[PDB]
Amino acid sequence: SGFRKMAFPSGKVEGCMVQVTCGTTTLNGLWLDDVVYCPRHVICPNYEDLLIRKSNHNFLVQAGNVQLRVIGHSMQNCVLKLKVDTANPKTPKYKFVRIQPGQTFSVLACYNGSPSGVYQCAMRPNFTIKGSFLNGSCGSVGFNIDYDCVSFCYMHHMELPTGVHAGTDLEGNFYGPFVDRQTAQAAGTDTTITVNVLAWLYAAVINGDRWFLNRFTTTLNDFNLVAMKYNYEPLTQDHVDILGPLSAQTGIAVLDMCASLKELLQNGMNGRTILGSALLEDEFTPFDVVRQCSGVTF
Amino acid sequence: SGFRKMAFPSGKVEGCMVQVTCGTTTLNGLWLDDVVYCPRHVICTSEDMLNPNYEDLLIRKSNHNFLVQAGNVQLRVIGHSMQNCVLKLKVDTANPKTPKYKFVRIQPGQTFSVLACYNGSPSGVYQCAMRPNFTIKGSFLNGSCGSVGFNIDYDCVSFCYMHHMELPTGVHAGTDLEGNFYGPFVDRQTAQAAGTDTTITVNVLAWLYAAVINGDRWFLNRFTTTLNDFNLVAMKYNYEPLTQDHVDILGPLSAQTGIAVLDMCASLKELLQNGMNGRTILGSALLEDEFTPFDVVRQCSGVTF
Ligand SMILES: CS(=O)(=O)Nc1ccc2c(NC(=O)[C@@H]3CN(S(=O)(=O)CC4(C#N)CC4)Cc4ccc(Cl)cc43)cncc2c1
Ligand SMILES: [Cl-]
């Protein structure tokens, strides 16, 4: 029993974190085989023009106490790829994957190539992440682990004026309409991840919390008319299909759970909590709920 | 900016997790140098749990009855002894991945990371606190026994908890790494109940200072309070008494923000009286008590917004 915001074990990622210094800027890099991946703003803007002047020895790469020697450099979108002379012996099995809004991942927050903490978070519908990062965190990475394979999905680039975070996939493509420079940048209005709230309501029923259940059902259209009024993302037939296993395990149809969510949206919790929370939680996917209520190991 | 429930990087602990099997029971063990530490109830059947005589069960075991698996490698057991509620299995191979470590006993209110494991394989990491009633609100399934709690300070791992049991209420109980239970619990299936839980006041105050540091002051007021008057009100909401030590510990956060501890205590008093009125503090609708004063200083910046 119990329900915690659980992150993946970070060990496979810790052995890839390095410190990258270019002039006065110091941030984190990801060392996989003989390449170090890091935000291209470490050289800070015409990035072709800024990069062409730099030579290999301008980049200082530190892995623990060892200094790695840079032998080549290239740019891929907003990510700088530094060819080093040593392959990382601790390189895990890995893939670079682009995630979709609503999907979750673990973040290994780092400063000076040294990991300091791990937390779980979700890619918001407005493509920002509500992370916890201080100055020097740039280059910290987001990932998921599937069996022995680490799927890297995020690299931190910047903090928006509202305290939220923006970054890229490991191929350097930003999540959201963000650019990597100091300019007027604001996150769009955020919405609640409906399929995730429903998954968390199923997790609550699995842990003995059933006070919110009712005898009523709803149509997908009527639920979406109500949900769109509380700044909730539309619920699609795919979302319903994905919630299938949780519906079969508890005996509560997805549109039956939707009628409970509709009543919680119009009436609140009345001094009650669900899984120790007074708010409706949207940072656990249907897969996360299944994994935490099954026992999948890495 | 931002405030998350952050766990320590688990890598140093992942390299110590092993699977321990004795007869039909399989749980997790911690492999440090040439010793594997695990709950002594690995030698029990479910029947034995009602009134287990551990000394009588242990005397009947030989080294080869314990199967220890580290990844794909089988470790050979060459000795065994019991220390309180933990079983110490001497193995013939020292763990090459043994980090710098200490065994520390924590006090209620202190936080730590938990590396949840099944079959000697780590599956997830989360942050939690030792509750005032000595239980932990963890997330553990069958096979998680032997999972460990820890903190990391520089390169040193301080092991503080080993999971032993889930109580009928869903809360978890366990021992320090010397086998001494936290709380009045026994590794016996007896009707033992967790005492009424209370809120960790010093931690809620620390989290209110964290909100002030990240730029939020809506909850502050023009009042102060005596420590005694604060405690008379706090006890009424099932909040732990705030001691002079707690006030001393909050000193640096009071100096950083310019808000005296008893001034922050007056805001807490009023928050308990009025609730939040549709507002949140650091993205939460409840008063959070699982961040210590030390955690706040660690995660939050030295410069206030
Ligand atoms: C579906 S679940 O709730 O996740 N199931 C479990 C099962 C066993 C879990 C477990 N094991 C123990 O705590 C064992 C076995 N149990 S028990 O009765 O099976 C425990 C329960 C109760 N009430 C069912 C939950 C008695 C007992 C007494 C003393 C000592 Cl030292 C050890 C033990 C530890 N942590 C999480 C566990 C989740
Ligand atoms: Cl302590």
State whether B117 and B144 are in the same domain: yes
Does A1 sit in the ligand 1 pocket, CB within 6 Å? yes
Atom of ligand 1 at shortest distance to CA of B187? Answer: 31
Give me A199's structure tokens: 């998954």
- Residue of chain B whose alpha carbon sits nearest to that of A134: B1
Question: Cα-atom radius of gyration of chain B, to the nearest Å?
Answer: 22
d(Cα A132, Cα B290) in Å, to the nearest integer?
Answer: 16
Does B144 sit in the ligand 1 pocket, CB within 6 Å? yes
Contacts of B3 in chain A (CB under 8 A): 132
Residues β-bridged to residue B181: B175
Resolution (A): 1.9
Contacts of A167 in chain B (CB under 8 A): none
d(Cα B148, Cα B170) in Å, to the nearest integer?
Answer: 18
3-state helix, strand, coil in chain B (%, to 5): 25, 30, 45
A275: helix, coil or strand?
Answer: coil
DSSP A205-224: HHTT--TT--S----HHHHH
Domain boundary among A92, A125, A145: A92
- B160 vs A73, A277, B112, CA distance in Å? 45, 27, 8
CB atoms inside a 10 Å sphere around CB B51: 9
Contacts of A132 in chain B (CB under 8 A): 1-4, 6, 299
State whether A106 and A177 are in the same domain: yes
B172-175 and B35-39: which strand pairing? unpaired
Measured from the alpha carbon of residue B249, the closest ligand is 2
Amino acid at B118: Y
Which listed residue (A138, A153, A156, A165) is catalytic? Answer: A138
Q: Are B51 and B34 in contact (CB under 8 A)?
A: no
Which residue's alpha carbon is at the smallest distance from atom 20 of ligand 1?
Answer: B166
State whether A84 and A127 are in the same domain: no
- The structure's method of determination equals X-ray
Question: H-helix or E-strand containing A274?
Answer: none
Contacts of B299 in chain A (CB under 8 A): 117, 132
Domain boundary among A92, A117, A143: A92
To the nearest whole Å, the CA of B197 is away from the closest chain A CA by: 14
- Residue of chain B whose alpha carbon sits nearest to that of A121: B4
Give me B165's structure tokens: 């049991």
| Ligand 2 ion: nearby residues, β-carbon < 5 Å | B 106-107, 110
Domain boundary among A44, A72, A92: A92
CB atoms inside a 10 Å sphere around CB A3: 25
Domain count, chain B: 3
Q: Is A295 in the B-facing interface, judged by CB distances under 8 Å?
A: yes
Give me the half-sphere count of Cα atoms (radius 13 Å) on the Cβ side of residue A259. 12
To the nearest whole Å, the CA of B166 is away from the closest chain A CA by: 8
Residues after which chain A has a gap (C–N > 2.5 Å): 44
State whether B105 and B9 are in the same domain: yes
DSSP B191-243: ---PPPP-B-HHHHHHHHHHHHHTT--TT--S----HHHHHHHHHTTTBPPPP
Which position has the token pair 């390449």? A35
Q: Are A127 and A175 in contact (CB under 8 A)?
A: yes
Residues β-bridged to residue A231: none
Whichever domain contains B265, its CATH number is: 1.10.1840.10
- Contacts for B274-282 with beta carbons within 8 Å, 24 or more apart? B279/B218, B280/A279, B281/B207, B281/B208, B281/B211, B281/B216, B281/B219, B282/B3, B282/B207, B282/B210, B282/B211, B282/B214, B282/B216
d(Cα A221, Cα A224) in Å, to the nearest integer?
Answer: 5
Residue among A151, A155, A142 at smallest CA distance from A36: A155
Q: Which of A10, A119, A273 shows the shortest C-beta gap to B11?
A: A10
CB atoms inside a 10 Å sphere around CB A272: 11
B11/A15 Cβ within 8 A: yes
State whether B117 and B190 are in the same domain: yes
State whether B40 and B118 are in the same domain: no
Which of left, alpha, beta for A25 (phi over 0: left; psi -120 to 50: alpha)?
beta
d(Cα A46, Cα A67) in Å, to the nearest integer?
Answer: 29
A93-96 and A149-159: which strand pairing? parallel
Q: Is A113 in the B-facing interface, judged by CB distances under 8 Å?
A: no
φ, ψ for residue A109, nearest 5 deg: -75, 130
Does B10 sit in the ligand 1 pocket, CB within 6 Å? no
A26: helix, coil or strand?
Answer: strand
d(Cα A7, Cα A102) in Å, to the nearest integer?
Answer: 16
DSSP B99-149: -EEEE----TT-EEEEEEEETTEEEEEEEEE--TTS-B-----TT-TT-EE
State whether B35 and B151 are in the same domain: no
Handedness of CA B138, B144, B149, B150 (dihedral sign): negative
Q: Are B292 and B206 in contact (CB under 8 A)?
A: yes
To the nearest whole Å, the CA of A238 is away from the closest chain B CA by: 28
DSSP A116-179: EEEEEEE--TTS-B-----TT-TT-EEEEEETTEEEEEEEEEEE-TTS-EEEE-TTSPBSSS--
State whether A186 and A246 are in the same domain: no
State whether A2 and A131 are in the same domain: yes
Residues after which chain B has a gap (C–N > 2.5 Å): none
Handedness of CA A260, A266, A272, A276 (dihedral sign): positive
State whether A106 and A157 are in the same domain: yes
Q: Is B284 in the A-facing interface, judged by CB distances under 8 Å?
A: yes
Give me B24's structure tokens: 């039909």
State whether B138 and B206 are in the same domain: no
Q: Is A76 in the B-facing interface, judged by CB distances under 8 Å?
A: no
A1/B128 Cβ within 8 A: no
Residue numbers of the domain that contains A84: 15-92
To the nearest whole Å, the CA of A223 is away from the closest chain B CA by: 24
Q: How far does chain B reach from its first CA to its final CA, in angstroms?
A: 9
CB atoms inside a 10 Å sphere around CB A160: 16
Give me B97's structure tokens: 């991945």
Q: Are A265 and A224 in contact (CB under 8 A)?
A: no
Residues β-bridged to residue B229: none
Which position has the token pair 């092993």? B18
Whichever domain contains B131, its CATH number is: 2.40.10.10
B261: helix, coil or strand?
Answer: helix
B141/A294 Cβ within 8 A: yes
State whether A3 and A48 are in the same domain: no
10 Å CB burial of residue B236 (0-12, 13-18, 19+) is exposed
Is B145 an annotated catalytic residue?
Answer: yes
